Design a protein around this ligand. Structure first.
Ligand SMILES: CC(=O)N[C@H]1[C@H]([C@H](O)[C@H](O)CO)O[C@@](O[C@H]2[C@@H](O)[C@@H](CO)O[C@@H](O[C@H]3[C@H](O)[C@@H](O)[C@H](O)O[C@@H]3CO)[C@@H]2O)(C(=O)O)C[C@@H]1O
Length: 115
């Protein structure tokens, strides 16, 4: 079945890093490269944190501070956020595109960054 599995909320500290564990799934009948995209505040600012298809789409606010630590071939979508700022608090949502066969996790993971 289609889905993304990750903690609902995670806490982080200013200046530190945060690794959001992530595993995704899709039906075995779907023909398969997979594009990985992580959004920040999808329903609002909708800024691109990670984009494996075209890194040029990444918002300047995240360039050099975020990296996809997962192996898409192994269905791992781990997100590493570096040099955390209080402004990084908010919800991050993963989206993967295969080919109609695309999926956006509406749940996402909410990050809280304190001093
Ligand atoms: C396998 C599959 O069916 N993939 C669909 C996906 C998934 O259903 C979805 O990602 C699961 O979360 O939906 C696709 O279309 C959706 C996409 O365009 C999003 C963009 O935000 O909107 C969805 O419609 C929403 C709409 O935006 C809301 O305003 C409304 O209240 O609810 C609608 C849903 O009922 C689209 O369904 C996708 O690309 O993600 C199409 C894939 O084929």
């Amino acid at each position: 079945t289609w889905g993304v599995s990750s903690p609902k909320n995670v806490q982080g500290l200013s200046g530190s890093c945060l690794l959001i564990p992530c595993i995704f799934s899709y039906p075995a009948d779907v023909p398969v490269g997979i594009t990985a995209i992580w959004y920040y505040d999808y329903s609002g600012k909708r800024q691109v944190v990670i984009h494996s298809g075209d890194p040029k789409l990444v918002d300047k606010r995240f360039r050099g501070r975020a990296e996809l630590m997962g192996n898409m071939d192994h269905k791992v979508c781990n997100l590493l956020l570096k040099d955390l700022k209080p402004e990084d608090s908010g919800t991050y949502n993963f989206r993967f595109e295969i080919s109609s066969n695309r999926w956006l996790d509406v749940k996402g993971t909410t990050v809280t960054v304190t001093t």
